[PDB]
């Protein structure tokens, strides 16, 4: 995407980090359910603005990372595909707007940015500026000018929905004794038994008054089984 015109991808229910042929990777992790994603081609200098807690025209007027997001970003030099003679003026971005962006805000209206009192009436002039810019990135580009391709990921960390990454597994099951457990949205250790009751199914799990987990809709049938902490006590 042209970053001012960024494009979502929404993905669930399936890592290339099992290689590192790609060059660049900003991250907060190293499996989980499902994700929102975006991607862009960017000149190597401007990537500075692409972090939580960042400045400048990108954070102003093209994109906004939430300063409290969670997610990861991978980038690599895309000169090889992209940094071609003369052209590449397709790859647009917004230089001005009436206001700064909120997280994942977007704007592709292209009215002339008036500035000050000027009733610029849709025509460019002094103090009457057209809102956008584009790289026109080319083979002579120094690396700060050269395009990197970049992909952006952020995590739908709610755990009742069923989804997963590509690389994951699961075992058989048993009804008793202490065991070490996992689910794509739940993991730990516990001494399981049956349940006296069943949930509203929208709830993935029952929880104690202490907020510890109590039961979960086990995907073997979304089934409901009720668990003591594994038998422990003073001596």
């Amino acid at each position: 995407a042209s970053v001012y015109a960024w494009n979502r991808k929404r993905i669930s229910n399936c890592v290339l980090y099992n290689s590192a042929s790609f060059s660049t990777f900003k991250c907060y992790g190293v499996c989980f359910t499902n994700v929102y994603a975006d991607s862009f081609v960017i000149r190597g200098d401007e990537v500075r603005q692409i972090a939580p807690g960042q400045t400048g025209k990108i954070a102003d007027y093209n994109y906004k990372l939430p300063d409290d997001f969670t997610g990861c970003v991978i980038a690599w030099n895309s000169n090889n595909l992209d940094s071609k003679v003369g052209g590449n003026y397709n790859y647009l971005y917004r230089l001005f707007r009436k206001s700064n962006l909120k997280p994942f805000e977007r704007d592709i209206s292209t009215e002339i940015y008036q500035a000050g009192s000027t009733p610029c009436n849709g025509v460019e002039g002094f103090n009457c500026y057209f809102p956008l810019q584009s790289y026109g990135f080319q083979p002579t580009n120094g690396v700060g000018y050269q395009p990197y391709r970049v992909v952006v990921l952020s995590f739908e960390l709610l755990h009742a929905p069923a989804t997963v990454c590509g690389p994951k597994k699961s075992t058989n099951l048993v009804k008793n004794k202490c065991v070490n457990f996992n689910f794509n949205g739940l993991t730990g250790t516990g001494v399981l038994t049956e349940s006296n009751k069943k949930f509203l199914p929208f709830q993935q799990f029952g929880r104690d008054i202490a907020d510890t987990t109590d039961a979960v809709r086990d995907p073997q049938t979304l089934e409901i089984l009720d668990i003591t902490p594994c038998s422990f006590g003073g001596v």
Partner: antibody
Framework: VQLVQSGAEVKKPGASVRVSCKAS????????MHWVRQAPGQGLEWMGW????????NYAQKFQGWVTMTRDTSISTVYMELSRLRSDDTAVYYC??????????????????????WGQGTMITV | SALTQPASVSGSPGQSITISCTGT?????????VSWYQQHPGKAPKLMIY???KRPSGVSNRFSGSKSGNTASLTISGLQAEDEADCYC??????????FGTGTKVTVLG
Amino acid sequence: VQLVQSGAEVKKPGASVRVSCKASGYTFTGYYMHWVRQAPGQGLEWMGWINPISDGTNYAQKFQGWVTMTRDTSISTVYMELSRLRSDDTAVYYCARGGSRCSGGNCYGWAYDAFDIWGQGTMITV
Amino acid sequence: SALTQPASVSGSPGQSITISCTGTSSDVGGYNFVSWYQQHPGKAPKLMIYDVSKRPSGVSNRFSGSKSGNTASLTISGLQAEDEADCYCSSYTSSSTFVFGTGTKVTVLG
């Protein structure tokens, strides 16, 4: 720096005529581009501009309703059509690329970087 | 446009004949954006001033652009026989328009 345009697209009077101009070396899109005309011993007109990085324009309202600018990014090219003219509309007509603002780069890479090559809207005979 | 300036303003070298490119407080005095040009006829022209007096890069030699109010007021900063030539003027104008002058022939004296 490069700039070129079409020459004497001659007619017989009353009619429409097309033009193309071309500029490069300069990052052709970098700012809005202007049309200009003069004739021998006459003054020089400006008639409007096109923005490469949009479709936006200005005109001199003398000319709107019978002049017809347009621009390209597939081949870094720009174009004009002068249409159904008055009899003996005849001169030489041109392209140029100045204006109000830096738009980065050479922060005043401006008008006479491109105030350039010529062509002759005309009628003639063998 | 009716914006105007004389013809064949002339002199012997070094005498620095001066060009009252003149218009209106809606154009020349309207705007901080006035512009000036010269040439040997038939060539593409030669700009010397783009705003009041600020010369482009390379434009320095024997140039003295200026404005006050509704007059752009360029001094050619002394003639130097430089001129099988003619001289011209322009500005940016209201509604982001642009304007041009009559221009002015030059001649050189002994």
